[PDB]
Amino acid sequence: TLGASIGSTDFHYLQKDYDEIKKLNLNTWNEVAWIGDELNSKIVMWTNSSPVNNVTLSSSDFINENGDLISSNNIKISWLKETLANIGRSNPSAPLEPFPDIIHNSGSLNIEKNKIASAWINIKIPRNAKPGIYNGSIEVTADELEKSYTFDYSFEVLNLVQPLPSETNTQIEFWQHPYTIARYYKICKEDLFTEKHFKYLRGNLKEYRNMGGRGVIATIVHEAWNHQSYDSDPSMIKWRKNSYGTFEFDYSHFDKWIQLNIDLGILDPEKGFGQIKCYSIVPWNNRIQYFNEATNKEEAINPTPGSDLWINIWTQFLTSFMSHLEEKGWFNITYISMDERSMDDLKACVDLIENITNNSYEHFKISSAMDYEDYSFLDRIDDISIGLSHINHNSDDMKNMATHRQELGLLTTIYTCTGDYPSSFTISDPSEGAFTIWYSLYQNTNGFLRWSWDGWVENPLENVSYKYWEPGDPFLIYPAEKDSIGKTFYSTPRLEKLKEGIRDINKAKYLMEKAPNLKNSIENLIYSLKRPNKGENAYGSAVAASKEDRDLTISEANRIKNGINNFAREFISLTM
């Protein structure tokens, strides 16, 4: 009636693989955690000819050798919900297949005949948990099921404390799209950035904060990315050309958005913690749009970057914006940002921003993300992000540039997007994200940027397909059901793997400071990282170059994590 086994969180259990999945029989799991850490696992279940109703998974408490308790309340077991994804990229003919990308709800599930269904297991180790080897069990029952399943779980909690994100130097930046969340939840224009809107922003922003999120995107012009996404990108700063004929700037949305992020502890502008990333002085395809009171219509202009028109406009804005930010106590964390723009384009922004100054001797910090590989010029950009496919693994150019930038107190990250492998798509193996984070440390960068926190298509919970990109590329979280009372978002295996990677690179860095006698050995481990090459599937999506490369991504991420935890054991053995 019902089959069950522990499954890996590294990859998806797909319906198409029913025949193979049916063969699984793993009944134990063990892992290593620090105090304040989290672990993940998964149970995969399958039906045969009969449907099975009221399938439930229940956790025992977790008990260490001393009898100390980690309550079953710290263990959340959530069904993985499938959604439909076109498996291609810009390929409407590609197969539309289901993927268990959504960490959905706890409680009971009815499963139809001849089906795979899996449940994600999230284990939180309290920040005051006692060290030790903790044992517990997860039981699977269902109405029809004669013999229930009990799976035996253990985890060792090492006597070291997982760093708080504030206590690390990890840089994490995921682009938020609060007007997309408004659209999905039918928040009207009149209620934008009111508590009615915040209802649906607060919880996912706390999720972002809690995993290490520091960067906060804000749009400063209309349609900065030329409406590449399903949803428009409105400006948080409204532009009007008035009756006399001058430009006015309405900062209301900007202010309410930023203050929210301050209130939640993502930004701290007095303290220079976090970033405000203002996109952009170079909108994609150059259009600057504004409401002209004469002629009363919306209007636009196409100035190419650098010109006198361009200089004066952005001067104007940057001037107002400066004063505006000085008013707030915010100016020190504000970056003017550019997304994959020309080298010649960047030239201008550095020059114009050079000029706009205040009586205090202060300057607008600058940010650029590049889809392309002498620091004279780049040193004038305070935060740069380089795409993974543009990092040559067989050169030290990246690592040397990032080492240099760090010496100057500048920011450097890596990003992934459409066409990358490893990456963070619905179709990706979730372990690819943990690899991605490790790779940011291998290249000696500050961390990881991704354009895609919450860029929902129409109804992600049922279909994720979009005209462009691999499926799921624009969002790392799902919305909740539209009418939901309570829940406002759901996480994903791929997001949980990015979280894991972040925790673990934070471990490595903590250990290299705490254990000088082990630092070189830790570094040797980190710099042993192998890199899979990329290929494409038949439908245009990036994938591993081969089965061997695909398996390498997974094995490497595990090898490094386990290495670091075994070094932690050695240091603990030392300082006892």
Ligand X SMILES: O=C(N[C@@H]1[C@@H](O)[C@@H](O)[C@@H](CO)O[C@H]1O)C(F)F
Annotated binding site for N-acetyl-D-galactosamine: 168-169, 214, 228, 417-418, 473
Is residue 339 a contact point for ligand X (CB under 6 A)?
yes
Is residue 5 a contact point for ligand X (CB under 6 A)?
no
- Which residue's beta carbon is nearest to the bound ligand X? 369
Q: Which two tokens stand for residue 398?
A: 């990246």
Residue numbers 212-231 binding ligand X by CB under 6 A = 225, 228
Which one of the spans 70-78, 294-302, 415-423, 480-488 is the region binding ligand X (CB under 6 A)? 415-423
Nearer to ligand X, 339 or 496 (CB): 339
Instruction: Give the CA-trace dihedral at 419, 420, 426, 432, to 10 degrees.
Output: 170
What are the phi and psi torsion angles at 414 (to 5°)?
-115, 160
Counting every residue written for the chain, the total comes to 576
Between β-strands 238-241 and 247-250, what pairing exists: parallel, antiparallel or unpaired?
A: antiparallel
Sketch the per residue contact string, 432 through 451, with ligand X: x for CB under 6 A, - otherwise.
Answer: -----------------x-x
What beta strand segments (E) does 396-520 contain? 411-415, 447-450, 478-479, 489-490
Nearer to ligand X, 239 or 451 (CB): 451
Q: Which two tokens stand for residue 38?
A: 């989290």
Q: How far is the CB of 175 from ligand X (least distance, A)?
A: 8
Which one of the spans 118-126, 160-168, 307-315, 413-421 is the region binding ligand X (CB under 6 A)? 413-421
Nearest to 83 by CA among 536, 467, 493: 493
Is residue 417 a contact point for ligand X (CB under 6 A)?
yes
Q: Which of 59, 275, 385, 446 is the binder for ligand X (CB under 6 A)?
A: 385
Q: Which of 157, 322, 369, 434 is the binder for ligand X (CB under 6 A)?
A: 369
- Give yes or no for a contact between 491 and 207, defined as CB atoms under 8 angstroms apart: yes
How far apart, in whole angstroms, are the C-alpha atoms of residue 363 and residue 334? Answer: 10
- Burial label for 28, CB within 10 Å (0-12, 13-18, 19+), is exposed
Q: How far is the CB of 529 from ligand X (least distance, A)?
A: 22
Nearer to ligand X, 168 or 423 (CB): 423
Nearer to ligand X, 451 or 478 (CB): 451
Instruction: Give 3-state DSSP helix, strand, coil % of the chain, rounded to 5.
Output: 30, 30, 40
Residue 258 is given by DSSP the state H
3-state secondary structure of 322: helix
Which one of the spans 190-198, 206-214, 345-353, 410-418 is the region binding ligand X (CB under 6 A)? 410-418
Nearer to ligand X, 173 or 255 (CB): 173
Is residue 571 a contact point for ligand X (CB under 6 A)?
no
What are the phi and psi torsion angles at 190 (to 5°)?
-60, -20
The residues of the shown chain that bind ligand X, judged by CB under 6 A, are: 225, 228, 339-340, 369, 371, 385, 415, 417-418, 449, 451, 469, 473
